[PDB]
Design a protein around this ligand. Structure first.
Ligand SMILES: OC[C@H]1O[C@@H](O[C@H]2[C@H](O)[C@H](O)[C@H](O[C@H]3[C@H](O)[C@H](O)[C@H](O)O[C@@H]3CO)O[C@@H]2CO)[C@@H](O)[C@@H](O)[C@@H]1O
Length: 92
């Protein structure tokens, strides 16, 4: 089953990286997306990654991938070999 976390951002500020911290099973395989509505339609930026030996995975997507005017959307986990939860996100 997919796991969805809503996010909210400034509509205008596009400095730096959309940075998501995940926590889960050491060395697990994982993938998903960041998704949002734009011009009426849902668009998706995919991520994939393994948790390190400490159980940490940091996904960084450039804020410039998300068009301006977008204020919200969802962090989605599509598959996870072990445990995985989003601890937080931040534009950085
Ligand atoms: O692309 C294959 C991938 O898709 C997963 O399903 C996703 C969709 O890709 C999409 O991101 C969808 O977005 C929803 C969103 O959750 C919200 O409800 C919004 O209003 O509407 C959009 C769709 O218009 O979310 C699902 C996940 O629930 C899933 O099938 C993966 O296993 C698969 O690899």
């Amino acid at each position: 089953t997919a796991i969805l976390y809503p996010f909210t951002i400034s509509g205008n500020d596009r400095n730096g990286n959309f940075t998501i911290n995940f926590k889960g099973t050491p060395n697990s395989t994982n993938n998903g997306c960041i998704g949002y509505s734009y011009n009426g339609d849902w668009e998706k930026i995919e991520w994939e990654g393994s948790c390190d030996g400490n159980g940490n995975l940091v996904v960084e997507v450039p804020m410039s991938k998300i068009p301006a005017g977008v204020t919200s959307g969802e962090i989605q986990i599509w598959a996870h070999s072990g445990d995985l939860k989003m601890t937080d996100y931040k534009a950085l």
